[PDB]
Design a protein around this ligand. Structure first.
Ligand SMILES: [Cl-]
Ligand SMILES: [Cl-]
Ligand SMILES: [Cl-]
Ligand SMILES: [Cl-]
Ligand SMILES: [Cl-]
Ligand SMILES: [Cl-]
Lengths: 173, 173, 173, 173, 173, 173
């Protein structure tokens, strides 16, 4: 409310609500990815685990944003969550390519919000993104890039065998 | 897939996917309720905690349903999640009344799915609902009814004072 | 001194000294608030504790600023500390309203210094404020807003009773 | 207030408030002394520590006096705190000479208040000063006198060397 | 590579590689300083230790920069490392003066890279420098300034004696 | 210096300084190798670790040589460090072949210095090389030869797959 709100623009407030929506949709996408890899006719437990962990992380990111919205005196507004863009996700390689595209889009939304906060001279918002989101995103994208390279190396050789080995020897399970 | 699927009708498979949607929408509603009570101009921490806990429980219920869908050889299909029906939730009394209505609707969906499983002679589905959902729902609804009675007793006396006392002396925080 | 000073403008140095003065005056104000609530004819121990804790926190903030001044090669200059603006602080509600106004003024001084550091391209100063002051201030202001809402809810109902209950059931003691 | 006040003269009440002011100004002076010795072009860590410890002790003395004021039913009144008399404090010898003069002035104020309490037949006040202040002051003044003698012995020999040795081998750090 | 690179300019990438070179050359300089003080005809173990520790710290700084380069999708390019500017480093005072000049030059390179990142709207780079380098550099420069003051105080008095005392009573060994 | 120097020829002193340069250049080469394998488009963590460990070992070898130089009364002289001979290192096989060539060159420099020490009747130097360097080098070269054989066996079969398996099942990570 007005009682606590200070140096917090309506443009940032709106953008934060949009970013919450994006994080929850990402979470929902990772839920779909995770359960696809648990299907009896896909059955890659390590890949299932990897995406289910990411679903949790994105949900937590949305919750941190909503907490911050309230701390600044903004008002959370929720919209519909669009279903994920695919019902079936292909191979481990297809899925990891989809995941990196998703993360790059989230990262771009984070960078655009930071630019907005810089333009509006809102250092608290800028620091909040820097300290909880931007470094986490860089590290996650690097990890997915490493995974992509290793999957490509393996399935170029021998696709079924390569997919199994990646799940067994790289991913946690 | 077809490899494992046995005694699992397309009607139950579809209904399970619909029930997943309902549980995720309930989770989303409880997220909204929880953060509303964390607003600086509402500020009832115990009520916030109560609804955030319920958001988690409903998400977990959806995850258990998706796990079961895969165990039976059905295919999870995700739809849009409709935003919650309100942006602001009123008093503790208004919110608890809304929550009990929501739970009764979920309970009715559980009972309707059980009836479907009984008609289709699917005992695994029937037992799964009985052992993970139906008793949990009865206990939750009883608890919310008890809370409603205590809130009504208090805010009839003295509304602001009564709301504070309920949050302090009944709800966890 | 000159031996270590690098990228540290005379304008920032002066402003830092002014900010030290403001933090020490805030500390002094909280000392007055705290001992007022310990008077035998006020006697709200939890409120006394809350303000005495804030007196300590503001003194520590001033000490951190003086440490930073020396680390950058600036010179601390001390001025008179003006007495607090009131000798008696009214009710818990009056006092919490006064405290939030004080915190908003400190927060504005922090934001103005950050803007100065940004204009002068002094990233060390900007980061120092971000990492030790700006988030702490946001969280404190949110907490005071929550307290204000709860006090207003209670004393609207029944003023004496409401004040006692807030001190007993919300504030630490 | 009047409810508890017994055998507590308006003259003692006023004097106690003046003594609070003197202790807080002493604290403020020791803060200045302490940070002066932390400057990169002075850089005597042990001397910095010694004066910062004294700043804390004098603040605590003021807090004990304010507690006693309330216990007796008097009313704390705060005045402006005058800035310290110097902006720069010279050598360790200059600073210790300044500190002993300050302590002798505080001690004289304590003795004058005790005499007032004796004249007004206020044994509680007399005992309070005897048991928390007068012996502490005697011991502190003796310690500063010992330090002065040792500094004079050293800097008479060789000023820079002597100052370093005193800081390293006598003062805590 | 291109697979992960996002919002990372070729100008920042190049500058980061130059900063790696500067940190490794600083490390190499500190190696030379450290072993000079271990010579049988210099023999100041504490000074040797101080510079060898700094050699390690600067190497670690370069490694963190190379890690970050890869995390962002840039490519590390290595150049020749120029030998240190002196073969013999004089007295403790001469060496500490040389070290502070070196640190001020590194600090200027850090500030120039931060300005570049600010101009290119690269908040991840800006925050990375703020959180791992800029505060560390300020604290190190303050420490060296303090050491310089203490060495000057001592060797002004009595050069050989003063150098020994500084090594024995200030520096770790 | 002359004060301690005994049976230590100017030819050995010079050669030791040259050997320090060679060890530091080897360290620098291994740094480059290590970070190349950490690139998102190479992404072989175990290979990165192996070369980074070797960078550390070679740096430590140089430090031991500089320590010995001082113990004998020689004077360390530092030269430029030439950048590594490649900017990109190819496959695991290419890199391990490059590493074995590098180690054989270091080993030859060690053997040539030992021969010099034997000719000059400097048993301390001869024993120092025997006890800290020559056996370590033999064991390292044997290990790299074993690795080469295993990599060749694997990538002859199936290059991408083979490289992954070697990194996962032989190298530490
Ligand atoms: Cl859609
Ligand atoms: Cl809708
Ligand atoms: Cl005034
Ligand atoms: Cl004055
Ligand atoms: Cl050169
Ligand atoms: Cl070259």
């Amino acid at each position: 409310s007005s009682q606590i709100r200070q140096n917090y623009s309506t443009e940032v407030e709106a953008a934060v609500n949009r970013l919450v929506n994006l994080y929850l949709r990402a979470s929902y996408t990772y839920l779909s990815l995770g359960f696809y890899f648990d299907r009896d006719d896909v059955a890659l437990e390590g890949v299932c685990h990897f995406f289910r962990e990411l679903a949790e992380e994105k949900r937590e990111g949305a919750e941190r944003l909503l907490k911050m919205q309230n701390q600044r005196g903004g008002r959370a507004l929720f919209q519909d969550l669009q279903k994920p863009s695919q019902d079936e996700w292909g191979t481990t390689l297809d899925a990891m390519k989809a995941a990196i595209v998703l993360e790059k889009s989230l990262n771009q939304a984070l960078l655009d919000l930071h630019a907005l906060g810089s333009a509006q001279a809102d250092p608290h918002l800028c620091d909040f993104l820097e300290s909880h989101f931007l470094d986490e995103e860089v590290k996650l994208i690097k990890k997915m890039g490493d995974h992509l390279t290793n999957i490509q190396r393996l399935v170029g050789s021998q696709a079924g065998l390569g997919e199994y080995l990646f799940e067994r020897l790289t991913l946690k399970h």
